[PDB]
């Protein structure tokens, strides 16, 4: 192939200067909006950093204090005045517990009410991916079915927007997905995806297809195309799909999705993320020695891409329900402003990961009279035991520990607020003036062929 599909293919690995130049004007926040976004980003990050007054306390050595502390334990003011495989496994479960909502779906479901009382929603993810055998893919299949029954019963008719949903990894459903051929995926994967989706629809819950490595995008689009034309799903708008802004294809994937919503007569739930597999995407392309990278090489270019993609998603409310997944205070503020005045609940929502977003979003989800923005947030809730945790944890470690990540830089008390919430288009123009060209690749990440 279709016009919109050909254009996805043609953009696969297009040069970074070219990709970033085309996004720039689509992501530029109009002056007045840009400053409202700066103001709100600044506030959100301020409150975050300075939760228990962590910067005002910073506005006031250690030897002296223990002396002052022991002096204050003297009850009387006068008296005082006058005077390898097991270590990896262990560290994994220790660092990973904060990211897991529970070990079983029922345990996770029972923890749901507290944040749901306040206006949060949930998307449960049964941990596990990259099934190696037929048996593994079967076991994931049954665990997903069980999760739907349990989530659907707790949803109890609340529907796709207000009630809980499920997220699924296609790699969990087909053995050796990473290398599987088109025909075997259709004959074997598709009937399982179709079946879980019919179940989700019987309970009227959202069912989201997660995005994984970039070599898998094309086939996920093929599976999506078919799923949207199932007669049993006609008139149901609960199908969701994740797109990754770090990909050069992302905008073209959107033009495709918009067309698919039109032809299949539905509103798609589209989760926009920046993307979780960047380190592997870079290694992978470097080992193939291909013409270029399928993802951006500077983080700021991903930020620009997200913004451009976000405007595109917000322009077609009849065709897409955007779900903006981020922990970045600027990103959130920009979307908030970009979405225009006259918010209505079903216009869009925010999303975050369990163990990462709560502090940002306690300022966002809830009543205005309590100082919140009154915008719903859906928490993505990993569910499983220690045997299914590893790949997810490692992705969380790369995200949290990267010096370009917002969650890492918010901690960095040396970096001031204004630099943290800086507008990314303005950052790209600043780089462009300094280097002589817009959208040059990362200096330390040369093209695979060098
Ligand atoms: C509800 C939810 C569901 C999710 N499900 C998925 C999913 O299905 N698929 C998936 O891939 N991710 C998924 N994620 C993970 C998500 O992609 C990461 O949390 C997200 O990228 C972190 O972005 P941020 O805006 O919070 O942080 P920011 O710190 O503002 O941006 C972080 C990032 O920018 C990108 N980046 C880092 N360095 C570079 C660089 N040198 N060049 C270009 N880009 C760079 C990476 O995407 C990295 O994650 C999900 C996240 C949420 C909240």
Curated annotation (Swiss-Prot):
Domain of life, source organism: Bacteria
Upregulation? By proline, autorepression and catabolite repression, and is potentially nitrogen controlled.
- Write out the ranges of the annotated region (Proline dehydrogenase): 84-414
User: Which proteins does it associate with, and in what oligomeric form?
Assistant: Homodimer.
Concerning its family, UniProt says: In the N-terminal section; belongs to the proline dehydrogenase family. In the C-terminal section; belongs to the aldehyde dehydrogenase family.
Q: What does this protein do?
A: Oxidizes proline to glutamate for use as a carbon and nitrogen source and also function as a transcriptional repressor of the put operon.
Q: What is this protein called?
A: Bifunctional protein PutA
UniProt organism field = Escherichia coli (strain K12)
- Gene transcribed to yield this protein: putA
